Design an enzyme around this catalytic site. Structure first.
Site, short mmCIF file in Angstrom:
data_model
loop_
_atom_site.label_atom_id
_atom_site.label_comp_id
_atom_site.label_asym_id
_atom_site.label_seq_id
_atom_site.Cartn_x
_atom_site.Cartn_y
_atom_site.Cartn_z
N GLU A 116 0.62 -1.03 0.05
CA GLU A 116 0.29 0.06 0.27
C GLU A 116 1.57 1.41 -0.12
O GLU A 116 1.57 1.55 0.91
CB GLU A 116 -0.46 0.38 1.19
CG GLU A 116 -1.87 1.20 1.28
CD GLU A 116 -2.91 1.28 2.75
OE1 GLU A 116 -2.70 0.22 3.20
OE2 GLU A 116 -3.66 1.97 2.57
N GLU A 200 -9.00 9.89 5.80
CA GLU A 200 -9.64 8.89 6.74
C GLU A 200 -9.78 9.45 8.40
O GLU A 200 -8.39 10.23 8.53
CB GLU A 200 -7.92 7.86 7.31
CG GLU A 200 -7.59 6.60 5.80
CD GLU A 200 -6.64 6.00 6.18
OE1 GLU A 200 -5.12 7.11 6.18
OE2 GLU A 200 -7.37 5.15 5.79
#
Ligand SMILES: *[C@@H]1O[C@H](CO)[C@@H](O)[C@H](O)[C@H]1NC(C)=O
Length: 218
Positions: A116, A200
């Protein structure tokens, strides 16, 4: 249009805006996304309020581009992107970040990866990325604090801006090249599975206004 539904998505011209409240079970509150335009990139805003689960991400409301054919990082010549955004609200504990998964298998499920890659343009509150700091690095003439760690079996590299970068122009190829040229990342064998941008949130009340987001793979 606007939706607060947990899994709302809106698509147009190869761009998709998603509510994606995958961590709602960690707290009390809501997340809404508003698409203003999907012509000439994505113009949209994310609105939310969350309480509880101090260190739990509640969601990743995001815009992303379709990737019909997976290609290796090395075969890609450019991954240009621009982002223009602002954050307002109260007691904001949240980030603003690109998210990309890669995997050796081009047919890998697209909801996880071998790796990621995150590029945090913004960081509000006392939150932090996966892993530990590997120091300050230069990508595109800007300084980033690079973090590295594991989220399960997946390896996560997060380049964190040293100042909130609300107007950004860059090329994600430079970040993959940094990993390839300094961290043994196999760009020759890893395929790009996703190319996303959003926030986020953890707790607080927030509005991320994304005045413009563009990205493509060439
Ligand atoms: C982003 O701005 C907030 C609010 O002023 C600040 O607390 C935080 O340190 C900033 N983050 C970065 C990376 O400069």
């Amino acid at each position: 249009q606007t939706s607060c539904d947990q899994w709302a998505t809106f698509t147009g011209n190869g761009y998709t805006v998603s509510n994606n409240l995958w961590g709602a079970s960690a707290g009390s509150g809501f997340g809404c996304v508003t698409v203003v335009s999907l012509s000439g990139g994505a113009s949209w805003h994310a609105d939310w309020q969350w309480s509880g689960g101090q260190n739990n991400v509640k969601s990743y409301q995001n815009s992303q581009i379709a990737i019909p054919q997976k290609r290796t990082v090395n075969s890609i010549s450019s991954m240009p992107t621009t982002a223009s955004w602002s954050y307002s609200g109260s007691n904001i504990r949240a980030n603003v970040a690109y998210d990309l998964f890669t995997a050796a298998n081009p047919n890998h499920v697209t909801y996880s990866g071998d790796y990621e890659l995150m590029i945090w343009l913004g960081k509000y509150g006392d939150i932090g990325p996966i892993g530990s700091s590997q120091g300050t690095v230069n990508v595109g003439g800007q300084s980033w604090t690079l973090y590295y760690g594991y989220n399960g079996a997946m390896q996560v590299y997060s380049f964190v801006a040293q100042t909130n970068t609300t107007n950004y122009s860059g090329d994600v190829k430079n970040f993959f090249n940094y990993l390839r040229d300094n961290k043994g990342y196999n760009a020759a064998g890893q395929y790009v599975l996703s190319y996303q941008f959003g926030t986020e949130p953890f707790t607080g009340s927030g509005t991320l206004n994304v005045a413009s987001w563009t990205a493509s793979i060439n």
